[PDB]
Each structure stands twice: as C-alpha cells, then as structure tokens.
Amino acid sequence: SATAASMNAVKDSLQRGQSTIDVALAAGDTITDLLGKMKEKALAASDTSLNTASF
Amino acid sequence: SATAASMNAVKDSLQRGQSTIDVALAAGDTITDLLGKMKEKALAASDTSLNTASF
C-alpha cells in the first residue's frame, strides 16, 4: 500500500508537466501567427518598384 | 505440588513478555506509516522540473 500512496504522489507531477506544455503551446501559436505576418511584410517590401517612403 | 506453584509463577512472566511485544508493535505500525510518507516525499522531490522553492 505504500506504493499506491507513491502513485498518488506521481500523478500531480504528470499534471504539472501537462500545464507547462499548454502554456508553451499558447505562446507558440501566437509566435506562428507573428511569423506569418512577418513573412507577408518582407515579401511586400521585396518589391523594386516601391517608393522610398514605403520601404 | 511445589511445581504447580512454580507454574503459577511462570505465567506472569509470559504475560509480561506479551505486553512488551504489544507496545513494540504499536510503535512499529506508526513507524511504517511514517516511512511510507517519507518515501512519498522523496519521490516527489526527485523531480527535475521542480522550482527552487518547492525542493
């Protein structure tokens, strides 16, 4: 029965690991959106017919 | 009949031995519970994803 108590101790650590990964995933989604937008900006600026004040 | 009187003397010592072993057993049960709890604590602390203030 001591071992069953220890399993009770293990489950919380597994849950904490889940939580940390969720936070990381949220930040990652935001970062991927920002990277898409940055690609759009760089692509738009790669144009050689552009004015000096839009670059 | 002297021997029967001596048996009367022996029974009390046997009973005293029983009593001492009961006290020891009670303390031992408490100790085993404490050891289970200590294992749980050590297992929980063996985690490397843990903060510096929970250790």
Side-chain angles (χ1 to χ4, degrees):
Chain A
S1 66
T3 305
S6 315
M7 311 275 197
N8 189 359
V10 172
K11 295 156 84 176
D12 64 358
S13 176
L14 284 180
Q15 283 173 330
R16 172 193 313 141
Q18 277 185 354
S19 54
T20 69
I21 296 195
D22 309 68
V23 188
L25 284 167
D29 186 74
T30 290
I31 285 176
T32 51
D33 212 331
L34 286 166
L35 277 162
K37 205 169 320 193
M38 293 177 70
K39 172 184 177 169
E40 191 163 12
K41 284 290 158 294
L43 190 142
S46 175
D47 186 355
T48 68
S49 66
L50 204 58
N51 211 348
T52 312
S54 305
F55 201 105
Chain B
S1 66
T3 305
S6 315
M7 311 275 197
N8 189 359
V10 172
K11 295 156 84 176
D12 64 358
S13 176
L14 284 180
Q15 283 174 330
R16 172 193 313 141
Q18 277 185 354
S19 54
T20 69
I21 296 195
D22 309 68
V23 188
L25 284 167
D29 186 74
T30 290
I31 285 176
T32 51
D33 212 331
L34 286 166
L35 277 162
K37 205 169 320 193
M38 293 177 70
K39 172 183 176 169
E40 191 163 12
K41 284 290 158 294
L43 190 142
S46 175
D47 186 355
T48 68
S49 66
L50 204 58
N51 211 348
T52 312
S54 305
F55 201 105

